[PDB]
Design an enzyme around this catalytic site. Sequence first.
Site, PDB file in Angstrom:
ATOM      1  N   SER A  44       0.774  -1.234   0.000  1.00  0.00           N
ATOM      2  CA  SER A  44       0.000   0.000   0.000  1.00  0.00           C
ATOM      3  C   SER A  44       0.808   1.288   0.000  1.00  0.00           C
ATOM      4  O   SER A  44       0.221   2.361  -0.115  1.00  0.00           O
ATOM      5  CB  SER A  44      -0.970   0.033   1.164  1.00  0.00           C
ATOM      6  OG  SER A  44      -1.978  -0.956   0.989  1.00  0.00           O
ATOM      7  N   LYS A  47      -0.144   3.695  -2.790  1.00  0.00           N
ATOM      8  CA  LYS A  47      -1.257   4.630  -2.728  1.00  0.00           C
ATOM      9  C   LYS A  47      -0.795   6.072  -2.835  1.00  0.00           C
ATOM     10  O   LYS A  47      -1.546   6.913  -3.290  1.00  0.00           O
ATOM     11  CB  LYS A  47      -2.063   4.409  -1.455  1.00  0.00           C
ATOM     12  CG  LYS A  47      -2.748   3.048  -1.434  1.00  0.00           C
ATOM     13  CD  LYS A  47      -3.487   2.753  -0.144  1.00  0.00           C
ATOM     14  CE  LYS A  47      -4.126   1.369  -0.205  1.00  0.00           C
ATOM     15  NZ  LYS A  47      -4.706   0.979   1.069  1.00  0.00           N
ATOM     16  N   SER A 104      -5.520   3.770   4.809  1.00  0.00           N
ATOM     17  CA  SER A 104      -5.187   2.663   3.911  1.00  0.00           C
ATOM     18  C   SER A 104      -6.416   1.869   3.474  1.00  0.00           C
ATOM     19  O   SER A 104      -6.386   0.652   3.381  1.00  0.00           O
ATOM     20  CB  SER A 104      -4.123   1.760   4.522  1.00  0.00           C
ATOM     21  OG  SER A 104      -3.288   1.213   3.506  1.00  0.00           O
ATOM     22  N   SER A 211       1.722  -3.313   3.769  1.00  0.00           N
ATOM     23  CA  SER A 211       2.043  -4.649   4.178  1.00  0.00           C
ATOM     24  C   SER A 211       1.233  -5.629   3.384  1.00  0.00           C
ATOM     25  O   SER A 211       0.203  -5.290   2.813  1.00  0.00           O
ATOM     26  CB  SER A 211       1.792  -4.828   5.669  1.00  0.00           C
ATOM     27  OG  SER A 211       0.476  -4.443   6.014  1.00  0.00           O
TER      28      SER A 211
END
Length: 262
Positions: A44, A47, A104, A211
């Site tokens: 992530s 992003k 997230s 992760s």
Amino acid sequence: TSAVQQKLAALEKSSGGRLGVALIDTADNTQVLYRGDERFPMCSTSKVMAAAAVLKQSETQKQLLNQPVEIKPADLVNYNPIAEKHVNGTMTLAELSAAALQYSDNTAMNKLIAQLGGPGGVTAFARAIGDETFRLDRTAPTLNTAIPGDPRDTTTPRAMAQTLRQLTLGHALGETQRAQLVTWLKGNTTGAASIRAGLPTSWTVGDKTGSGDYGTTNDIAVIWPQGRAPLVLVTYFTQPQQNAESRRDVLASAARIIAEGL
Ligand SMILES: [K+]
């Protein structure tokens, strides 16, 4: 091999996984690298690129961040703490950007990706801002499979540090947009165990974690040390077995070594 690299290698040896680090110190525009040209799964941390790409689009569309996006029940994936409140409703592109970065939220990420025309739209933005290394190949959550040797959804620490510097401290984005990205990163909720945990309390941090499988534990940060010019720090970590546990402490230890080595 520098003293800092020697310390990072000793950390890595005892962790059992594979560690990648890149620091840019903007005081002197120098870099410190450990496995800096090896590829790692971004998870992530990707992003940031997606949100930045939408911010770039907003430079020529004043109303873009207020544009509503439908959230349908089928849009929910594995981790959607913000989007699930808006199913059968809407979120604006600003709301999706904030949810993706600060919480997230994977549904939010997928909406950013879709606004850019798919994962290759995120890659295209990376290329446009001079990053020839980054690639986004999949949506969430499959972009987090983090299979060893798989090139999909990877970058190198060197490339990511350079891009994150351009986005947050340089001129990849317009001034308003840069400030918005920095505000979002500084408001992250997920980062206090990662890079943050290895730095003195007085230093301020904006970051994005990631992760995935293989115990993959990542963080990318822009850091304002007490009394020093800003730093950009990337810490990537991945392990040999699919089911491995997260090791945010290893990222904190890498950050501590970097801070102690300035
Ligand atoms: K995991």
